[PDB]
From a paper:
The (His)6-tag present at the N-terminus of RemA did not affect the binding of the wildtype protein to DNA fragments containing PepsA in the EMSAs, because a tag-free variant of (Gt)RemA showed the same DNA-binding behavior as its His-tagged counterpart. These findings show that DNA-binding by RemA involves the arginines 50 and 51. To investigate whether the variation of these residues impacts the structure of (RemA), we aimed at crystallizing the (Gt)RemA-R50A and -R51A variants. Unfortunately, both variants did not crystallize, likely due to the lack of the arginines 50 and 51, which are relevant to establish crystal contacts involving the sulfate ions. Superimposition of wildtype (RemA)8 and (RemA-R51A/R53A)8 shows that both structures are identical (r.m.s.d. of 0.3 Å over 600 Cα-atoms) and the positions of R51 and R53 overlap with the varied alanines in the RemA-R51A/R53A structure. This analysis shows that variations of these arginines does neither impact the quaternary nor the tertiary structure of RemA but impairs DNA-binding.
Bacillus subtilis can form structurally complex biofilms on solid or liquid surfaces, which requires expression of genes for matrix production. The transcription of these genes is activated by regulatory protein RemA, which binds to poorly conserved, repetitive DNA regions but lacks obvious DNA-binding motifs or domains. Here, we present the structure of the RemA homologue from Geobacillus thermodenitrificans, showing a unique octameric ring with the potential to form a 16-meric superstructure. These results, together with further biochemical and in vivo characterization of B. subtilis RemA, suggests that the protein can wrap DNA around its ring-like structure through a LytTR-related domain.
Residue numbers in the entry:
A (entry chain A), C (entry chain A), E (entry chain A), H (entry chain A), I (entry chain A), L (entry chain A), ...: 2 to 78
B (entry chain B), D (entry chain B), F (entry chain B), G (entry chain B), J (entry chain B), K (entry chain B), ...: 2 to 79
Amino acid sequence: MMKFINIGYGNMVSAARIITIVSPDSAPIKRIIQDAREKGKLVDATHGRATAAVIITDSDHVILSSVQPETVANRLY
Amino acid sequence: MMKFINIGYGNMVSAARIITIVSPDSAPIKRIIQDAREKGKLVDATHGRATAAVIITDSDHVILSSVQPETVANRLYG
Amino acid sequence: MMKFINIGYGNMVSAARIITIVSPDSAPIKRIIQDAREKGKLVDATHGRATAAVIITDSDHVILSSVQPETVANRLY
Amino acid sequence: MMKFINIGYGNMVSAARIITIVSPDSAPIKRIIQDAREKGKLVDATHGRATAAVIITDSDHVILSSVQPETVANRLYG
Amino acid sequence: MMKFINIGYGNMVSAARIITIVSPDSAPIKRIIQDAREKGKLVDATHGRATAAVIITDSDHVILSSVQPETVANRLY
Amino acid sequence: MMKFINIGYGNMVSAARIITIVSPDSAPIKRIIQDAREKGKLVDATHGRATAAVIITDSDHVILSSVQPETVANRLYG
Amino acid sequence: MMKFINIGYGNMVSAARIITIVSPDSAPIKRIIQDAREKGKLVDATHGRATAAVIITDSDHVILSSVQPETVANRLYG
Amino acid sequence: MMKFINIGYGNMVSAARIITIVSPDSAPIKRIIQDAREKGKLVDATHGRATAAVIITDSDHVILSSVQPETVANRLY
Amino acid sequence: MMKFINIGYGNMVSAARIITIVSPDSAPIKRIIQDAREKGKLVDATHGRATAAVIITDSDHVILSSVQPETVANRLY
Amino acid sequence: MMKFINIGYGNMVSAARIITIVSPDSAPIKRIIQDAREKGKLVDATHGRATAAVIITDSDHVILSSVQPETVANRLYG
Amino acid sequence: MMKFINIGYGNMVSAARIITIVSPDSAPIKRIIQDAREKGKLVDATHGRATAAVIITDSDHVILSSVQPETVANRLYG
Amino acid sequence: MMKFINIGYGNMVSAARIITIVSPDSAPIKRIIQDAREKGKLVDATHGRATAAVIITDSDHVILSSVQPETVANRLY
Amino acid sequence: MMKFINIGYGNMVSAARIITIVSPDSAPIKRIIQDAREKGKLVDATHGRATAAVIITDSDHVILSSVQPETVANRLY
Amino acid sequence: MMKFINIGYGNMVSAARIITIVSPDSAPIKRIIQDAREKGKLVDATHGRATAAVIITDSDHVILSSVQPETVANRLYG
Amino acid sequence: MMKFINIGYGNMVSAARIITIVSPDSAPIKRIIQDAREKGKLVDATHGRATAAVIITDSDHVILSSVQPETVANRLYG
Amino acid sequence: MMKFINIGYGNMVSAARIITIVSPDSAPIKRIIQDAREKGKLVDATHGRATAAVIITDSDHVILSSVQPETVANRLY
């Protein structure tokens, strides 16, 4: 079981710091992304690809990934 | 016992970060949802379907799920 | 030993987040309930039944349950 | 070693959240009780009987119990 | 090894919450006691006896005990 | 599984304090670097070479490394 | 490995709460001592003897000890 | 594996409190040192020798050591 | 020119403390009223009549009046 | 136009510090009184008689008076 | 020179509390409106008509008016 | 009209800084006095005489005077 | 002497709320503009024209004007 | 009526910044002096002589003077 | 007596907002300039020329001017 | 009566912003100077001469002057 999860293109997130991993396709999460962009809490790890998952961490950073949310979780192993 | 729980339509929550999982069936939890919406702490994981469970996390985010609360809790085990 | 406790009618609370579980029948806890209602920290999980237990969590949420307080604690197992 | 301790009349406290359990027998702890009453941090679990122990928790709540302090501590074990 | 330590006359302190246990016989700790008295963080558990130890907890409460400081620590066992 | 990870040129980071390790390849992470520079939270461990990984720690420090992000993560194991 | 360390003359410190143990031999640590004195965070456990070690705890208290820093650390083990 | 690490000349740091150990030879870490000096968070444990490592702790103290950074980490054992 | 303005049924407001006087008939001001009710900043001076004006003061209190907003302002004289 | 207004039984308030003077006749102002009582911001100048006016000051103190609100305001002039 | 300015449909603003009066014609002021809406600082005095002026007050409230900005300012004088 | 008011025995208060001057004979003002004593905001200018007036200032200091409250106000002239 | 100053195209600023009016042509003021944009404190009143003056107000809003800075000040009259 | 008042030995205070001028003759004002000393808000203008007046300013600084309180106040006028 | 002062090259400052106008000729004011630069409170009105005066305003902004401090002050009068 | 006071060598202070002007020759004011130095609130306007007056302003800046304190005040005129 991994401490660090590959969220695509070599970018890594600590599993123990994740609160939730969700789809980017509704208004509340879009509000969270724009808030993070304004506050300097946004990290874009999609490396030019479509955003498929939004990772919210306990430091209240918001990380964009090109990977399916369930796949990010699956990569714990 | 799992680290991440599928709360419907591929959306995942860390089990250790959950405080409570309740029905959306009364005024106080509805106040909590609207507060979270205003503050940018709301996450809607229902994928357009009826809200069946409201998840409050220790980061004081509020997550809407389309599955019953007991279903979220039962999925702690594989 | 459970991580999540059924506090009645399918509603769940994380055991590790509970500070105290008390009866609702005196002035100080009633002050705590009304404070939580005003602050948006109250959760009513009694599902139309009489409040039998008041659960205070470490996030300072206040959760109303229809179950006896000792029974909520017993459900840890 | 128990997670929840019965402090009398069915009222329960999480053992890991307790900082100290003391007698109500002097001015400083009485100051702490009145401060908690004013701030909405006081919990009275005495069920109308004499206060015998004062429990201070890490959330800086103050809980009144009708059982002796050593009795609260001893109940940590079944 | 105990979770709760008897600090005299039945009064109990959680061992994991203690930062330091010191003698009350110098100016800096006396400043700490008076600050706690003013702030409502002082607890007097000496039950009418001479203060022999001052316990500082992580919640920044200050607890007076009639017991030798090394004896309080010894009571962990 | 190691406590400290060498991120290049002798510089060390505590593994348990890392939140994320990402490429410096877009505007949001560059915003994070400049914010840290202004606030005195930036640490440059590149030893004059090209930045290949950006480490964000739970203390909300930002650490620049000359090694690829996957290399930082792989070094968790000896 | 002990929970409490005797730092001289019966005074005790929780090992898990210590951040650093250093000599009082330079201006920065002396600044830290004077700041703690002003703020009411200083604890003098030297019992009237020369300060040999300065203990900084996670509660940002500052504790003066009459024993060498290596002696405080060595006493972690019985 | 040690709880306390000797960072030179008898000075000790708790390993679990360290965030990062870096060289002092660039502008950002020098900003961190000067900030700590102004704020009263700086600790100089070099005991008159050249600074070889800068230790940042979770309490946001900054500790100067005369030892190589990798050597400080090696001393965990 | 008055220091105190009669806002109906003998209730008085200091003119110099008023920021704005508006109609209660749209969503944003209704949000302001409900926020004030929750926070303990609401004052209801309508004395059982329909709310015709909402007074926002510099202390961020919200005062309900039964009088037309322009009439409240006119009463400055 | 006076600086100090007699609000009954010798008690005085600075006119320039008053925000509003209202009847105690509804739930919101009663919430304000109880909040002030809990916080130590309440001043009772009624001298044991029925409360007829509630004065809120810019320091967010709450003062109870036994005279009608219009009487407080009229006394601004001698 | 008036204390209160009619900003349309009977709605009034204290002139001394106004910081700026601008057109709603660009992204930054629209950001300010949406921020105020989320925070409960927005006041809509347009009475259902097109927004022509945005008033920012020193209490950091944001007030929407249906009259041109120059009209608000000109009404300072009777 | 004075800037400074003699509140007895040579002690002076700036008139423009006073919020209210009240009798000390009820529970709420006694709470205010004890709060100020604990917080280091209390000033006792009675010079050994009975407290007749309690002065609350905008800095939230609380000043005890031996003079009738209406007399303190009268001394503005 | 005006209370409100026309800063171009009908946009108005209260003169008493202005701290400084400066040219936009150097790095520090550009930092101030970008900070305000991120924080939601920026107001763009240039109405599609080149920015000629940057107005900093006491509420720490930043207002862009198409008018020369000295001309904005001149319009006080 | 003067802007600056000489409080002895050339030391000056702005009259408009003074809240109260009192004797140092009781425990509460002594608490205020010691608090100011600890916080770095104390100013000693006595030039080595007995403290006769204690000046509290709106910046919550505390200034010690060697002249009687009535003398400070009387010097408001030339 | 003017409301706005020209501090060189068309840049204007409100006279009532100025706390102090000093030479850039020592370490403490240079510390103030660098702090303002880091925090986004610095304004450079020198138009590329040597700094001759440093203006600190009540909003704790720091403004660099190319004119001597006495020149800024003298321009208060027309 | 001046708005700005010359405090020596062309350096200017706004009279309305001054709280107190005192001699630098005792421990409490020296604590205030060192605090200001650490916090970045110190301004040294002595231009290489002996400090004769310490000016404390309402923004809690501390300004060193080479002029007698009573002379600074006299320069109001």
